[PDB]
Each structure stands twice: as structure tokens, then as C-alpha cells.
Amino acid sequence: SMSVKKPKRDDSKDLALCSMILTEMETHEDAWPFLLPVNLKLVPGYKKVIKKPMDFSTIREKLSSGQYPNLETFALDVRLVFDNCETFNEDDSDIGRAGHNMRKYFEKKWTDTFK
Helix, strand or coil, rough: CCCCCCCCCCCHHHHHHHHHHHHCCCCCCCCHHHHHCCCCCCCCCCHHCCCCCCCHHHHHHHCCCCCCHHHHHHHHHHHHHHHHHHHCCCCEEEHHHHHHHHHHHHHHHHHHHCC
């Protein structure tokens, strides 16, 4: 509350560390569905159904331009990529499996780097 603060957690490396995680996600062999924004002109249903599209290149541009106020807003956009994927793709599809795999990969790096 006013004049009453928990001890300051060191957040000075968060930007570098989120960038490293994102690099690891960019280079994963199953990243291909997620590297670029879904082409809204060429994929029927996407525009209407997926209210907030997100992809790795969009996260990378937001990261690089100071548009994440803190490491939690970064994780929310990463998770959005996977949540969108599960909304639009059957579990038993190549893309559906890719999303599960990448979500797992991310959540481990997230815990190991920060928790």
C-alpha cells in the first residue's frame, strides 16, 4: 500500500531473457505455423473467429519496440498464440500437435528461467 512495499525483485534482465526464450521458440522445428501472422485474406473463418491474432514475428516486433510493460504481458501474448491455435485446429492435425508441443516447450523455459 502507500509507503509499504514488498522487496524489489530484480527485473533488469527480463527483456534479454524474454528475447532468448523467443529465439528458442523461433528456431524450434515445430514453430512453422506460428512464425508469421495468419493470412486473413487466404484463410476462411480466421478473421471472424480469432478475435486477437498473435504470432512470433508480431511478438518479436512488440518486444523490440518496448510495447511489453512487463514479463507477464509477454507471456500472455505467447500463450495467446497457442490458445488461438487450439481454437482453430483439431488436436489430431499437424498444426494442432505443433501448438501443444510449443506450449509445453515454452512453459518449461518460462518456469526454468523465472520460477
